[PDB]
């Protein structure tokens, strides 16, 4: 019941940096690899050194070099640090093919090595952005090959959603749309997260004046471990990744649950506050704590899963659920009666030294399949239209070999996706 973590691009790697740091914090792992104690993510060598089961890929050396110069470079095996010599210029054409195609075989074989190291691989998780090159384009290439050799193993993807505020590439819509299609084709579950919503949480609930990616990544990393580490460690009601597939995807296409997380409270505001299971879950149904820029009250629910860490009793959860059903404004779709899944571990939430969040006694992760996701898609469609109407910058992809129809096609596929969410939301 092991897994592999794949980090592509700076978005994937920098997030990964916090993720593995967190895993060290969860089990008392020293940077040197020495750890006296997580075998799902680490393998052990005869030296008593543990090695992260992960692959870090960046087509430009730069970020990988950062890894190589950091403290955890003694944790990572040199073969897991793979780099190219030039980026994809924020461009899928290069990421997916022109450049990335020259490295991907190395990458896949290192994955195989790890796959052979694992005895019972449940699956793997991938981190990347939607708008980058390496992070999007290369990622697409990668998933094409992984679904060939692994197939059936869990394909979890964590994708960063381009915000209107932050925008670092003018052709991000194009990059994102191309990517999206391929993730529809090969992922099992995609989680897109909006840095702009996260910033909002950090400035209001963590009270942070000036959020950076380093703080943003800490938040995300903890959420990801609450989903996985928490499954590995055992608790009361353990919930496997296969159960998430089974329970969260009603139709082959609706594989886009979103995440909301609480408690996200600064130490200073946590004093004085004690949240019950019910109260934390009430925070989880608030749009203001949503890690994606959309409105949960607008959309309808199809699936919802709550995962618990630390001090939680099933009974309290049962009461909390009743409250959500009655309080809310949780319009669930007829197609799914009642769909709330509950996983409860005993493992307590962990705290990062030099962190920005309070120590908490219980924590809740909300995963949910809601029709509000279409909203985000609509925003991207529009942006595409504008760029594509003029065909500004199109030569940067076409000149690398892309076909006009490929862009049309991908957009259309997203339009279909959104329409499918509409359809499921239509009660029947």
């Amino acid at each position: 019941r092991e897994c592999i973590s794949i980090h592509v691009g700076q978005a994937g790697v920098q997030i990964g940096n916090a993720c593995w740091e967190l895993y060290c914090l969860e089990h008392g792992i020293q940077p040197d690899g020495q750890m006296p104690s997580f075998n799902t993510f680490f393998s052990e060598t005869g030296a008593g050194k543990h090695v992260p089961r992960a692959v870090f890929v960046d087509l430009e050396p730069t970020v990988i070099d950062e890894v190589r110069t950091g403290t955890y470079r003694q944790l990572f095996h040199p073969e897991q640090l793979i780099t190219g010599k030039e980026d994809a210029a924020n461009n899928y054409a290069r990421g997916h093919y022109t450049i990335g195609k020259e490295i991907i075989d190395l990458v896949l074989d290192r994955i195989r090595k790890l796959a052979d190291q694992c005895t019972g691989l449940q699956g793997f998780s991938v981190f990347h952005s939607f708008g980058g090159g390496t992070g999007s384009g290369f990622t697409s290439l990668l998933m094409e090959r992984l679904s060939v050799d692994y197939g059936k193993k869990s394909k979890l993807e964590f994708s960063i959603y381009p915000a209107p505020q932050v925008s670092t590439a003018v052709v991000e819509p194009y990059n994102s749309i191309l990517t999206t299609h391929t993730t529809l084709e090969h992922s099992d579950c995609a989680f897109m997260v909006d840095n702009e919503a996260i910033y909002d949480i950090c400035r209001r609930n963590l009270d942070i004046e000036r959020p950076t990616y380093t703080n943003l990544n800490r938040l995300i990393g903890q959420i990801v471990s609450s989903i996985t580490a928490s499954l590995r460690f055992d608790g009361a009601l353990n919930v496997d990744l296969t159960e998430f597939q089974t329970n969260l995807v009603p139709y082959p296409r609706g594989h886009f649950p979103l995440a909301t997380y609480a408690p996200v409270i600064s130490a200073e505001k946590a004093y004085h506050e004690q949240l019950s299971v019910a109260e934390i879950t009430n925070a989880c149904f608030e749009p203001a704590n949503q890690m994606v820029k959309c409105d949960p009250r607008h959309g309808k629910y199809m699936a919802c899963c709550l995962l618990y860490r630390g001090d939680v009793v099933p009974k309290d959860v049962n009461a909390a659920i009743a409250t959500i059903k009655t309080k809310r404004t949780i319009q669930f779709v007829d197609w799914c009666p009642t769909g709330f899944k509950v996983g409860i571990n005993y493992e307590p939430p962990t705290v990062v030294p030099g962190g920005d969040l309070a120590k908490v006694q219980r924590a809740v992760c909300m995963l949910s399949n809601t029709t509000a996701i279409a909203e985000a898609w609509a925003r991207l469609d529009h942006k595409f239209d504008l760029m594509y109407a003029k065909r500004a910058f199109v030569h940067w992809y076409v000149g690398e070999g892309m076909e006009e129809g490929e862009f049309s096609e991908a957009r259309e596929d997203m339009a279909a996706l959104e329409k499918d969410y509409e359809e499921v939301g239509v009660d029947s």
Binding site: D234, A236, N238, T242, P252, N318, C336, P337, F340
Partner: protein
């Protein structure tokens, strides 16, 4: 006279953990398997549930089965893991994902064949099997899936042995998985044809007992599964110890099943109240019968008074007079005659044995068979139809290879069961 018990799934594993704990307590068996009892009677029928190992150590006649190692290991790590032999730990490494199709139809079948060989081994070691007991969920993949496969194979091999099972029933307030009704329906469909009886216990009701009567602020499964084990041990007390009436489970089956397809039961228990009030208690048979009749002390989430009784079995533990018990239970029927079905004069049957539960002077276990039970089937069938009509999540089972008609027919049989309760209702 022997019984083979099988624990399937976490539910099965944890409830059974408590069950075996209790049974060893009943006989003075310590966690190592050594006998340090109090009475000769503790040994006298120890054979129903145990093998005598060299050195006066006993091994529980039961198999632990799952698809997840961790669970199995956690059970084995606790007291009573030591009492089990390695031979009874059968498991895989990847759960079913709550999918009956994976448990019953595909993956679980792979283990079931090895389980059955162990079953056979144990039945061969026995002198004469009385029956089999399974503990499992109605909504889980191995609990309902794998377990039902196992049942079809066991009943096939032993047609005249008593197949009974205890199982956890879904509720609107409990429901974890969206396909839980799907798993339930499929299991029900099979269980109605392949078991002699099944006990329907609902966690919801159990939580109410824990707080309402037991005054617990935090009901836990450790205690909830305790209550179940009380009732599970109650039904074989007389079997294991001398008494006066109805010791045999088959006798009970004869008296509790008026019609082949209506074999679902409502367990309950007395005395069941917190310690705070215990100092004001005075157990008498009327007191026990008051608590056993009262729907609030039922473990099944269903009020019998909403329907009508076909049969009632009451098992008494501890030294009570014949008159007191038989008069009082008659009086229950007399006073609440409006809730009994007129077909059966003397709907209440009793069993009385001479050995009380450790810590109590007297105790009583309630088994009801009332038409009210149909409500639990309505909850399942209804939820099912909503999902089924849209085929939400169905693809996960069709991925395994299940046919829409397999589910359709499963529903049909559930509908039959409700209609039969209605036919007897009134």
């Amino acid at each position: 006279r022997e019984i083979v018990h099988i624990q399937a799934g976490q539910c099965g594993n944890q409830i059974g953990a408590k069950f075996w704990e209790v049974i060893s307590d009943e006989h003075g068996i310590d966690p190592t398997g050594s006998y340090h009892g109090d009475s000769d009677l503790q040994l006298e029928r120890i054979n129903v549930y145990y093998n005598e190992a060299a050195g006066n150590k006993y091994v529980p006649r039961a198999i632990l089965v799952d698809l997840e190692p961790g669970t199995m290991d956690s059970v084995r790590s606790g007291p009573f893991g030591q009492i089990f032999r390695p031979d009874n730990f059968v498991f895989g490494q990847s759960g079913a994902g709550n999918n009956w199709a994976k448990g019953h139809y595909t993956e679980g079948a792979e283990l079931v064949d090895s389980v059955l060989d162990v079953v056979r081994k144990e039945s061969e070691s026995c002198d004469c099997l009385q029956g089999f007991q399974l503990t499992h969920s109605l909504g889980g993949g191995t609990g309902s899936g794998m377990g039902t496969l196992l049942i079809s194979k066991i009943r096939e091999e032993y047609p005249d042995r008593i197949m009974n099972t205890f199982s956890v029933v879904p509720s609107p307030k409990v429901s974890d998985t969206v396909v839980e009704p799907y798993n339930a329906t499929l299991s029900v469909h099979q269980l109605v044809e392949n078991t002699d009886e099944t006990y329907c216990i609902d966690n919801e009701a159990l939580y109410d007992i824990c707080f309402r009567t037991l005054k617990l602020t935090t009901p836990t499964y450790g205690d909830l599964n305790h209550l179940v084990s009380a009732t599970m041990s109650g039904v074989t007390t007389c079997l294991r110890f001398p008494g006066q009436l109805n010791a045999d489970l088959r006798k009970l089956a004869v008296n509790m099943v008026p019609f082949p397809r209506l074999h679902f039961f409502m367990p309950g228990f007395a005395p069941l109240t917190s310690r705070g009030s215990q100092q004001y208690r005075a157990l008498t048979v009327p007191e026990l019968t008051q608590q056993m009749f009262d729907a609030k002390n039922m473990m099944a989430a269903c009020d019998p008074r909403h329907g009508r009784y076909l049969t009632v079995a009451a098992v008494f533990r501890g030294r009570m007079s014949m008159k007191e018990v038989d008069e009082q239970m008659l009086n229950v029927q007399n006073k609440n005659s409006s809730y009994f079905v007129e077909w059966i004069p003397n709907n209440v049957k009793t069993a009385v044995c001479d050995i009380p539960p450790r810590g109590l002077k007297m105790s009583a276990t309630f088994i009801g068979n009332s038409t009210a039970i149909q409500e639990l089937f309505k909850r399942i069938s209804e939820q099912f139809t909503a999902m089924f009509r849209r085929k939400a999540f169905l693809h996960w089972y069709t991925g395994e290879g299940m046919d829409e008609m397999e589910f359709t027919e499963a529903e049909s049989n559930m509908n039959d069961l409700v209609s039969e309760y209605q036919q007897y209702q009134d």
